Symmetry: C3
């Protein structure tokens, strides 16, 4: 799975979260977000493969991507604790982090 | 995903398993149990972060957590082989391992 | 999760893909295929554990297994891009790679 596959999975799963009804689905969808972010952890967007693993421009991508992953884990939390709507509220701000990270590296 | 997020996912997925009907769901839910246990493999419960990675008290947590993971894989087995109920019977004993591991490290 | 557990998951998820209707399910099922292939990446089939990690017969298994994983990522693509049927067409050829890899290492 390359970078744009996981990001499109994140964006699609966020739509499944806002349209879900129970806590099992939002926990299921958030875990897929964690799964998609886990598979593309070592991946590189098609914009930065010509920039070094030690370059600040791509290490920006490394902190921003793992910042996305830790916010997902905070959202998986409230879904597991039963707070299904605070998780959906946390998933709404998560879409901001997903949208911003995707736009500056997508096409 | 921290330790208590995965354990609450395990406990919730065990409830989805006993309430499922086919083999695809129990295989789906058991794979999420494997996924939750995989994401929190290197994690540490909020009780032992002040105990060393080489301490016997936390290496107890490392064997007990990976013992949980290998029992999950044995349960993913029977669900994949079509033995949907022997998997649910294996998931019931899996809840014992999940409950015992969670209680001695949860809050 | 051992090797035959993931392969039976792949074979079962391929049946869920051809029977699905939207793009969320096929993306969900394809991500489980990526998940099953990820958990059994370092695993070894019950036929080759008596053959070295540096032997060509098992390194054949290593390239063939990771070739399966990269074809999955190409299938997760079209499902995420909305091309739900080109993904199902890509999942049909994926079953060929799954069947061939499974038969020469299964029992
Ligand atoms: Ca609805
Ligand atoms: Ca029922
Ligand atoms: Ca149908
Ligand atoms: Cu992993």
């Amino acid at each position: 799975a390359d970078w744009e596959a996981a990001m499109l999975t994140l964006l699609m799963m966020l739509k499944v979260i806002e349209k879900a009804d129970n806590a099992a689905q939002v926990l299921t969808a958030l875990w897929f977000m964690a799964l998609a972010a886990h598979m593309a952890a070592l991946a590189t967007p098609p914009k930065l493969e010509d920039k070094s693993p030690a370059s600040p421009e791509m290490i920006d991508f490394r902190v921003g991507f793992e910042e996305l992953a830790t916010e997902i884990g905070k959202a998986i939390k409230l879904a597991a604790l039963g707070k299904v709507k605070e998780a959906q509220a946390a998933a709404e701000q998560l879409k901001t982090t997903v949208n911003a990270h995707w736009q500056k590296y997508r096409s």
